[PDB]
Design a protein around this ligand. Structure first.
Ligand SMILES: [Mg+2]
Ligand SMILES: [Mg+2]
Ligand SMILES: [Mg+2]
Ligand SMILES: [Mg+2]
Ligand SMILES: [Mg+2]
Ligand SMILES: [Mg+2]
Ligand SMILES: [Mg+2]
Ligand SMILES: [Mg+2]
Ligand SMILES: [Mg+2]
Ligand SMILES: [Mg+2]
Ligand SMILES: [Mg+2]
Ligand SMILES: [Mg+2]
Length: 48
RNA sequence: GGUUCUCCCCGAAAGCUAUUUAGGUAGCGCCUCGUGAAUUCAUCUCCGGGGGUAGAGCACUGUUUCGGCAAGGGGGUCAUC
């Protein structure tokens, strides 16, 4: 127990998705939106 | 139109329905991750079923040719009260 030996529970912290950061990321160009509809646009999508 | 580091595992759709809808979107179908559960599911063999397609046929609804039977047509001639 020193200020540089404390570590979080396992599974307690998970990295966020980061869209549009290359091929390898698995989340490049389109960023998980597919091609070219209303739902791909910034602000795009239909009301409830 | 563009969307910037890496590796591992799985892996579609371009259909149906609706839409001032048709290059948009929503539910379902197909993809993924998780949880739960029945020999649940597949192929083969044997058993039980309904069919009206392929082929065929011409009783029926239609169509078609030839021959006998000819109803009855129509043509001559006299009649034509
Ligand atoms: Mg990822
Ligand atoms: Mg990908
Ligand atoms: Mg694009
Ligand atoms: Mg399109
Ligand atoms: Mg789309
Ligand atoms: Mg805008
Ligand atoms: Mg694969
Ligand atoms: Mg179909
Ligand atoms: Mg209808
Ligand atoms: Mg039968
Ligand atoms: Mg038939
Ligand atoms: Mg036939």
């Amino acid at each position: 127990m020193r200020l540089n030996t404390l570590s979080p529970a396992e599974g307690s912290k998970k990295a966020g998705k980061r869209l549009g950061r290359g091929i390898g990321s698995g989340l490049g160009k389109t960023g998980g939106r597919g091609h070219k509809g209303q739902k791909s646009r910034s602000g795009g999508g239909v009301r409830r």
